Amino acid sequence: ARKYFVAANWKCNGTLESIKSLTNSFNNLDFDPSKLDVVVFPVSVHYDHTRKLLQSKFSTGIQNVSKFGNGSYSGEVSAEIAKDLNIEYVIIGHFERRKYFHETDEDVREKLQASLKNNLKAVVCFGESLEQREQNKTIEVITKQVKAFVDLIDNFDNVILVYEPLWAIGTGKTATPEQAQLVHKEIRKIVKDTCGEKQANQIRILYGGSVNTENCSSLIQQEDIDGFLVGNASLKESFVDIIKSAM
Amino acid sequence: RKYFVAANWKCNGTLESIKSLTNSFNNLDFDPSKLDVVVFPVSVHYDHTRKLLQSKFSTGIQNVSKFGNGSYSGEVSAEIAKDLNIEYVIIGHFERRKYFHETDEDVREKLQASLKNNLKAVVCFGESLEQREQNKTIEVITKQVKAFVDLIDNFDNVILVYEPLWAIGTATPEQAQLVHKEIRKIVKDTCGEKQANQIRILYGGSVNTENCSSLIQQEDIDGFLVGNASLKESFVDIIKSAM
Ligand code: NA
Ligand code: NA
Secondary structure (H helix, E strand, O other), rough: OOEEEEEEEEEEEHHHHHHHHHHHHOOOOOOOOOOOOEEOOHHHHHHHHHHHHHHOOOEEEEEOOOOOOOEEOOOOOOHHHHHOOOOEEEOOHHHHHHHOOOHHHHHHHHHHHHHHHHHHHEEEEEEOOOOHOOOOOHHHHHHHHHHHOOOOOOOOOOOEEEEOHHHHOOOOOOOOOOHHHHHHHHHHHHHHHOOOOHHHHHHHHOOOOOOOOOHHHHOOOOOOOOEEEEEEHHHOOHHHHHHHHHH | OOOEEEEEEOOOOOOHHHHHHHHHHHHHOOOOOOOOOEEEEOHHHHHHHEEEEEOOOEEOOOOOOOOEEEEOOOOOOOHHHHOOOEEEEEEEOOHHHOOOOOOHHHHHHHHHHHHHHHOEEEEEEEOOOOHHHHOOHHHHHHHHOOOHHHOOOOOOOOOEEEEEOOOOOOOHHHHHHHHHHHHHHHHHHHOOHHHHOOOOOEOOOOHHHHOOOHHHHOOOOOOEOOOHHHOOHHHHHHHHHOO
C-alpha cells in the first residue's frame, strides 16, 4: 500500500532559536520512518541547522530548486548542489512561486527533469483557481498541469503530487474533505490514463490546502489522500498531532 | 574609501571544492581594516563556507527577498539574514533581472528591506548592447540608480556594481572607467559630492587574473564583483591587485 507522507512547509519563517524549540518538540514524537514519511522543508539558509537538530526519523528537503544546473545563475540552488549536500527532497510548483515569481508549467517540468537526473525526490504542486473552478474547468486545469511533467516520472515512490485548492486559499471558501477527495481521485485517474494503473496506485497524492489539528483526520481518511503539505500549522508544536493523524 | 573585492560563486560549488577553495583563500595574508573582501556562496553553502573562512573574509548571500517573513515559499527574508548575522546581500544582479524578471521596483524594495534589517548591499545595474547602440548608457544607468539611490544612508554600506551587459557574452578598462565616472556623477548630483567620493563602485564585467590590475588602476573603479575567476585558488591574485 502507499506510504503516508506528512510534510512541513515552513515557507519564509524561523529564527535559529525558534527552530531549536520547534525541532525539539518534533523529536519527542515516536514514529516509525519505515512506515510513514515525515519531511521538514526549512528556508535554504536554515537547512544545516534544521538537519542537525531533527532526529534521523525525520526527512528534510528544500522549498524550491533551480531549472538550470550549475553555472552562471546567481541566487539559484542547482539539483547537483542539493545532491552533493544529500538534500533528499525538493518542493516544485508551489503556488506562491507560480503567483509571485512567474513560475510556469514548463519551469515545473524542467525542474522535475533536473531533480530526477540528480536523484532528488520531488514534491510537485498544482491546482486550480476560484475562477477556473467556477467555470467548471477543474479537471481540464489539473490535467494540463499534471501532463506538463508526468511523463518524466521515473519511479512512482520518488515523486509526490500535491493538490493545492487555490479556489479555497485566500478566497474565503473552505474545501470540504469530499471536494478534496474528488479532486484526488481525478488526479490519480490522470496518472492512470497517462502512465498506467500500477504507477497511479503507487504514487502519493498529498492534500496541500489548509490543514490543521481539527480537519486533518477527516482529510487523511479519504481514499485518495495520502498525506499533507502543511503551511502555517507546521510552525506550531501541535504539528505533531497532524503527523499522528497519519499514523 | 576602501577597495572592495567580491567573489560571486553564483550556482557553483561542492562541499569538497569549498573546503579546498576556502583554505587557499585563508592562506592569503591581508588586512581587512584596509580592504573589504566578501565571499557570496550559494544559500545552502553559506553556513559551510562561513565556518571555513577566517574572519578577515566578510560573507553574504546572492539574493534576498522583497517580502518580509511569512507566506513566500522558497524566499529568504532580510529578517532571516539578520538573525543569521549574514553581512551582505547582492541585489539586482543581471542574472536575476534576466532569468527571473527582477525589476527596478524589486531592487528598491529589496534594498529598503536590507537597510531596515541592518544588512549591507551590493547593488548591480548596467545597459544592454541595444541600449548602448542607441546612446542610452547614461539614460539607462541613471534610471536604474535613481530607482534606489535615495535609500542609501551610510555610503560605506551600499556598494554599486556596473555590469556592462553590452559586453558580457570584453569592455576595455578605458570604456569601463568612462561609465564609472558617469555613475559617480549620478551619485554626486543626487546624494552630494562627499557621499559620491565615499561610495564604492565595482566593475562587474569579466574579471580574471589577465585583466584585474588594468581595471582596478582606473580612477573610478574601486574593485570588482568577480564571477568564475572567484571559483579558483588564483582568486587570491585578484584580491592582491586591490591590496
Ligand atoms: Na487516505
Ligand atoms: Na581604482
